[PDB]
Design a protein around this ligand. Structure first.
Ligand code: GTP
Length: 177
């Protein structure tokens, strides 16, 4: 499985380059993927994310982290298979978990025709920007390479992957780590 990293509160300055404990935010995402079973990583970039594109080219230039260019998943062109689309702000994300998500996705198609939604119980996640009847989106999803409709299932984990949308969000992010 390969992966896609999707890249204005708190200033609307590109977050992915926001710095936490000396590392940019995206490094935290990239790190798990690499240790990650998901081998190739595609980092979708866009304007105001130019600086990001650069850090990435320069930073992972020696790597196989490739940059791509509302919601455009003008990226299906790349994956011939279902990929993991992750936001560029996750905290506390681990490869072990990831194995489970991708592993889980298939166990299912064990009985299916898809997209997967990974959500955290509210008990685990605090100060959630979004809560859908008690489930908080982790910003990690499995998807198929299509531009239309997908039958999306839901996966639940008691682990917490926090995403940052706000500055206070950052405090918590640092508190976690
Ligand atoms: N290139 C690109 N990335 C996006 C776009 N929308 C969301 N993302 C990425 O997907 C992740 C989840 O979206 P958000 O957390 O809402 O990012 P955001 O839109 O900058 O946040 P806001 O300040 O509320 O607008 C973010 O880390 C973004 O990097 C987009 O339209 N273009």
């Amino acid at each position: 499985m390969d992966a896609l990293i999707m890249a204005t509160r708190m200033g609307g300055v590109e977050k992915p380059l926001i710095k936490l404990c000396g590392r940019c935010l995206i490094d935290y995402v990239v790190s798990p993927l690499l240790k990650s079973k998901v081998n190739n990583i595609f980092i979708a970039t866009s304007p105001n994310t130019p600086k990001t594109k650069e850090y990435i080219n320069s930073a992972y230039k020696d790597y196989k982290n490739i940059v791509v260019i509302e919601d455009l998943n003008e990226c299906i062109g790349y994956f011939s298979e279902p990929f993991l689309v992750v936001s560029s702000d996750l905290i506390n994300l681990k490869s072990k978990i990831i194995n489970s998500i991708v592993d889980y996705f298939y166990c299912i198609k064990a009985k299916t025709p898809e997209a997967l939604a990974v959500m955290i119980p509210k008990e685990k996640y605090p100060n959630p920007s979004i809560d859908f009847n008690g489930l908080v989106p982790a910003d990690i999803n499995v998807v198929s390479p299509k531009h239309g409709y997908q039958k999306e299932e839901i996966m639940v984990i008691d682990e917490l992957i926090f995403n940052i949308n706000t500055k206070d969000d950052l405090k918590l992010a640092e508190m976690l780590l």
